[PDB]
Design a protein around this nucleic acid. Sequence first.
RNA 1: GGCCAGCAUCAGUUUUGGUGGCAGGAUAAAUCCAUAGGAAUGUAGCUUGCCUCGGUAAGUAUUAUAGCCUGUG
RNA 2: AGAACUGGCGAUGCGGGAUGAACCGAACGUAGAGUUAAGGUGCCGGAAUACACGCUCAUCAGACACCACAAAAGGUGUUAG
RNA 3: GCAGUCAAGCGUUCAUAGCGACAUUGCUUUUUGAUUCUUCGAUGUCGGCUCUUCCUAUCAUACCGAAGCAGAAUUCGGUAA
RNA 4: UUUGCUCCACACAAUAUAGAUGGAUACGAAUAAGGCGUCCUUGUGGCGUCGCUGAACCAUAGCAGGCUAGCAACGGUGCACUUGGCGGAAAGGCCUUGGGUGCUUGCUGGCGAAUUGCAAUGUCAUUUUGCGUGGGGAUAAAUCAUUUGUAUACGACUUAGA
Lengths: 197, 193, 136, 172, 191
Amino acid sequence: VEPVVVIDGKGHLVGRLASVVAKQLLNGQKIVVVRAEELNISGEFFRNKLKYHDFLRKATAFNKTRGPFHFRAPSRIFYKALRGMVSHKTARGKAALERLKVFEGIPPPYDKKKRVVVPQALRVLRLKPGRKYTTLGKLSTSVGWKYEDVVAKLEAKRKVSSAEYYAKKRAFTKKVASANATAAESDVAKQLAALGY
Amino acid sequence: LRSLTTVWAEHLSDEVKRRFYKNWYKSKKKAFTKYSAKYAQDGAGIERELARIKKYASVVRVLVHTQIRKTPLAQKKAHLAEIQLNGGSISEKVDWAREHFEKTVAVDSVFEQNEMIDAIAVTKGHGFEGVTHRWGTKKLPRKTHRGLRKVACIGAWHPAHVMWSVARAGQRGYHSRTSINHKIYRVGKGDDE
Amino acid sequence: TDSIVKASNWRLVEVGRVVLIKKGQSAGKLAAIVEIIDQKKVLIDGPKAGVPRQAINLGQVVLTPLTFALPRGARTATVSKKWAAAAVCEKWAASSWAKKIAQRERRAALTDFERFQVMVLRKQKRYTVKKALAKA
Amino acid sequence: MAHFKEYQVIGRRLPTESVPEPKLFRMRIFASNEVIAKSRYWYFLQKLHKVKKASGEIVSINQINEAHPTKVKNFGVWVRYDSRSGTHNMYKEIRDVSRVAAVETLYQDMAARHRARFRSIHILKVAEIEKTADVKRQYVKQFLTKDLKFPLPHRVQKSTKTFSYKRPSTFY
Amino acid sequence: MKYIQTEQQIEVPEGVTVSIKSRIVKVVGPRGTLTKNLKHIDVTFTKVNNQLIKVAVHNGGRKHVAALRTVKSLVDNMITGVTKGYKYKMRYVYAHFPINVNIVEKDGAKFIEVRNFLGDKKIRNVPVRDGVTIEFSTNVKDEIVLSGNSVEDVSQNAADLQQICRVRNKDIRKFLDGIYVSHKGFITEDL
RNA sequence: GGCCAGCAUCAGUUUUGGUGGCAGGAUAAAUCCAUAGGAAUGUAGCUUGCCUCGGUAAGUAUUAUAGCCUGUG
RNA sequence: AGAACUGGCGAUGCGGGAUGAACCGAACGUAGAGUUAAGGUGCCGGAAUACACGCUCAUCAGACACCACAAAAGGUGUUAG
RNA sequence: GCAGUCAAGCGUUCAUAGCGACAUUGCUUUUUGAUUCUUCGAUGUCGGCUCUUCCUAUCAUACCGAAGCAGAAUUCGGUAA
RNA sequence: UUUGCUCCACACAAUAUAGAUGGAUACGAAUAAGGCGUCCUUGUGGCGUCGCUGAACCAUAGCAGGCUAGCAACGGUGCACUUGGCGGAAAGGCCUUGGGUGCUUGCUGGCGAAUUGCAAUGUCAUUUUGCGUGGGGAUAAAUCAUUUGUAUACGACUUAGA
Ligand SMILES: [Mg+2]
Ligand SMILES: [Mg+2]
Ligand SMILES: [Mg+2]
Ligand SMILES: [Mg+2]
Ligand SMILES: [Mg+2]
Ligand SMILES: [Mg+2]
Ligand SMILES: [Mg+2]
Ligand SMILES: [Mg+2]
Ligand SMILES: [Mg+2]
Ligand SMILES: [Mg+2]
Ligand SMILES: [Mg+2]
Ligand SMILES: [Mg+2]
Ligand SMILES: [Mg+2]
Ligand SMILES: [Mg+2]
Ligand SMILES: [Mg+2]
Ligand SMILES: [Mg+2]
Ligand SMILES: [Mg+2]
Ligand SMILES: [Mg+2]
Ligand SMILES: [Mg+2]
Ligand SMILES: [Mg+2]
Ligand SMILES: [Mg+2]
Ligand SMILES: [Mg+2]
Ligand SMILES: [Mg+2]
Ligand SMILES: [Mg+2]
Ligand SMILES: [Mg+2]
Ligand SMILES: [Mg+2]
Ligand SMILES: [Mg+2]
Ligand SMILES: [Mg+2]
Ligand SMILES: [Mg+2]
Ligand SMILES: [Mg+2]
Ligand SMILES: [Mg+2]
Ligand SMILES: [Mg+2]
Ligand SMILES: [Mg+2]
Ligand SMILES: [Mg+2]
Ligand SMILES: [Mg+2]
Ligand SMILES: [Mg+2]
Ligand SMILES: [Mg+2]
Ligand SMILES: [Mg+2]
Ligand SMILES: [Mg+2]
Ligand SMILES: [Mg+2]
Ligand SMILES: [Mg+2]
Ligand SMILES: [Mg+2]
Ligand SMILES: [Mg+2]
């Protein structure tokens, strides 16, 4: 529908976000995902911490360097949920994956580009009220991720600039509405009402 | 951590310049000769790099080198390195830094008597070492065939791979080490019988 | 320094609450909650729009902000009489919701020529507005 | 077993010379179709009478429709069923708009709570509870209070495209 | 079975105004002001009038409904704590070694420093929590007093002290040494 | 007329829509209409006790200034 | 380890049970179109993140015949009786 | 070989601090048997030496809950390899 | 080593392409709550309004978009300039001034289109490189061999040499 879709991970549930992201790439839609630190997983923090430690013990006994690799960053926990939903040892699969990008925070390009959401993976739409859940960033710091603070700091900075932007814009569309209303009631506008506009 | 700029002194001793080369004698020694020209223009582009470090920068390290010529060594080529500056505000740091270009700094300005310090250095080299002395493994008995400074069992039958955790012959020494807590007993001065 | 406690003012399932039916032979049609079966199921009735008295899932319906006085479990004739009385239809019709529904129904019926007329007309409109938007 | 119709079924043991005109017995039966219905009939007659289908005959089979299908009713429901380790009688109450609707949710309920498949259940009686206050089970009493109203918090709308440009709102 | 709604009442008295957006509760009164975050629960606060507030749960289960009352309690104890306030009294208890308890400070501190416990050369320290103040009761022997607007911080600061003086490697039935909470009340008297 | 296509009219197989006429059953059951009777999650009225001028509540009260249930046609 | 009756594997590919001699479906000439079996339909992966009523929250939940295990006993967790 | 359930008894008194009969439910696969699938056109025994890694049904070491824990000493139990 | 390198420009030739074909159209936060407007005592404030999907918004007419005239506006927008400022998370982009110039389907005119034959993607994007031309610009090093021994089985390392 658009050349590149930018997804605001915040408030999405990992494997449901993954399931849709994977399909899209396979079908040829480039996807970039931001604020993976604000991803969720159902299940209380402790549960998913225990799960993560299960993962953590699997290693190649003769050489741990060849063994399963354990990435600690929310973006990359995420990639993992994703990568495992893609026939990723096939050309067709590598190709789909090159179509993907994932970030903690919203770094340049994407901070001035619109981001969407994916309602069929929106936690607030899916999880029954009262069911505990985990935030990706908090899970990740506990298994080694080093950059929650730095991301938080940048994000607060970015969030201030974006508040300005918004404000300016909302000021501007107020003017624009003031304009659109002198033109209301005019002849060309009554005609357009007639045609559903 | 990522570096965004480096600002350099305008004059550089041949001692450092030499570090930037693999064949000094043959070379035209053109290192930094355009950089040096940046000072000409009033200072314009040097200030703004300095400016840039101040505006941003979570940390400031300074670039120093040794005066290996003041040393009985034969190896002319000096050692260059980044030392993190730790007093004041970031801006005070780069002010310190700019102020000290081409200028010189002494151990007493950094260490004192009875201080506990650490030492970072590459360990002596010993080349290819067998298992006994490299790992402190027990000499096999005198009767054993095929030699005896070895490990008798290099692993069980399964895993059917030699493992990362058993001792094997190979290089010994010329390692990085970070050794800590060495008390300073004297801070001597060169100009002092 | 009064207390000031939010609110949260949900539409209620309740006898006399009008609902807009979202899928089925009816669909897009209004109806009234007559009686109330359990947390998930109500008895609805919509004579004015020709929707049969029936049991239905709340989930098949979307509650509207309109209510009118209805006796619990009132039959169809009563329903039609009270409905007309409270004139819910013009009330609905006046709502932005209703209007937004009529809008896109009209948009969807546009002829290809009409589409081309809309465009000409928006160029026309854009001209004078983009003007106004530069003199204040 | 499905979406139920309710059937009157009438049978009798076959006539004989010395006993022409045998007695004629009736059952109401909830089934998805008349084939299952006649089957169920023979199933219960044999738990009650010396008969079986080879020596009996179906006399009539008719669907009974609800008298007042758009009138909400409070049902009392009486069931026999088997569990994994014994067999048990039960009384439940179901609020709906027809016996037929009511019996569907019963099997559903029996399957969900007690894990009883259809084979394991005997409906003993389904009867409309005429006076509120002979209503016994509180999960229904609850829906009989005067001027009853309740909101439906946390509204969740079905998206029709995989991407959305807003950020939904569960208001309602 | 899911109860279609149960609700609770929260009386409000003359001194105080309570103010709740999202589920962030603010209670102001004569003794200061407390706030508490109820977002983790799902309940609907309604003002009926300046001395009454309802909290309710729609279509709730046992565990949910079970949380209605404790919400009511929590905000009740915010209101009273802001009118009467809370006072917790504890007593030192020892059979031979007199337990010595002062207030100390290191970098804007306020710590409760417990010394000599069961003879211990060790020096026990408990921080004072903010909003709780400490008096060593005159006219009563070996009594400490912790008071403040918040039952939560007062009670927890008390519990910290009684837990910093657990006995180890001893029959704690005989070795009864400790600092135990002895009375739980309000600050403003008559009430 | 070699190569490959497009459309039309057909034939074999098949898929997927729109629409017409009928048969059955409690000659569907309902709604609706008429009629008799009734009740309460009791509509008007009335009583009484509080209560900022009528709002509540707890009584009476079976169609009145809402309605519903059940049978019969 | 040993018999009975049938059906299979051995001598047999094909679709399903991830994998597998024997289970489920179905038995094979070379091909087109259609429709199904058993089994499936979040993504891997063709196919409803379909509809509907309940139940379940596990600091070692559970997840489909053959089949890749769990018992006595016990719970003021919760459900219905 | 290891661990439970019931609780008659043991334990001055007192079933369950620590134990536990008659019964009875299990788990384990460093015991020994039972089997005979793979290897008899070869997969070289027992012990020790050396060396790594793993399990936990924990002997010591950290922190705990019990006691027929006064103290010292000990015993039972939990998180723990 | 036979006139080489680099940035900008156009020119011919290639080579390609995980897949342009109107637009990736920027708050944050909450969901048992919010957006927007508006007032004010500027607050966990009053009042109004909206949702119930982007089925939107923006753009969109002209030989794939030709050649031309005029009017009404003084608006819009393309391009190359120029003024002031911002953005380091991967800023490499955003904003602002001012003159110039093109287009304007805001409205009204003149001319052109066929024969590509009843369809045939009917060719309109963006990759990397190669070769000459001429506007700026810039004028090294590494390796072998030799040598040190803080290094070394051999390579490697570390020194030294106009
Ligand atoms: Mg381990
Ligand atoms: Mg730079
Ligand atoms: Mg040696
Ligand atoms: Mg040694
Ligand atoms: Mg040594
Ligand atoms: Mg020998
Ligand atoms: Mg050895
Ligand atoms: Mg102890
Ligand atoms: Mg002791
Ligand atoms: Mg052809
Ligand atoms: Mg045909
Ligand atoms: Mg028909
Ligand atoms: Mg009424
Ligand atoms: Mg054979
Ligand atoms: Mg076969
Ligand atoms: Mg896969
Ligand atoms: Mg698929
Ligand atoms: Mg079975
Ligand atoms: Mg299997
Ligand atoms: Mg139970
Ligand atoms: Mg053994
Ligand atoms: Mg016994
Ligand atoms: Mg005892
Ligand atoms: Mg005894
Ligand atoms: Mg054998
Ligand atoms: Mg052999
Ligand atoms: Mg062999
Ligand atoms: Mg051999
Ligand atoms: Mg071998
Ligand atoms: Mg253990
Ligand atoms: Mg413990
Ligand atoms: Mg005793
Ligand atoms: Mg270990
Ligand atoms: Mg382990
Ligand atoms: Mg490609
Ligand atoms: Mg609002
Ligand atoms: Mg506002
Ligand atoms: Mg407001
Ligand atoms: Mg829009
Ligand atoms: Mg044009
Ligand atoms: Mg023209
Ligand atoms: Mg980037
Ligand atoms: Mg050139």
